[PDB]
Amino acid sequence: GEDSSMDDISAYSSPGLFGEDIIDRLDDPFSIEDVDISLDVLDNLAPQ
């Protein structure tokens, strides 16, 4: 009843977020996954 040896360390990292069990599979509407730009060229996507 006090088995700190076999303890789910996955829960030691506390679930500090509300919707963790729920899974989202759709494309995140903030990523460059389907856009094609390289680094230091992402500066062209700056404001204006």
- Contacts to other proteins by CB under 8 A: 33-38, 40-41, 43-46, 48
- Least distance in Å: CB of 3 to other proteins? 33
Of the pair 8, 40, the CB lying nearest other proteins is at 40
The secondary structure element, H or E, covering residue 32 is none
List, as one string, the DSSP characters of 6-27: S--HHHHS---SSS-SS---SP
Of the pair 17, 32, the CB lying nearest other proteins is at 32
Of the pair 15, 37, the CB lying nearest other proteins is at 37
User: Contact 39/32 with Cβ under 8 angstroms?
Assistant: no
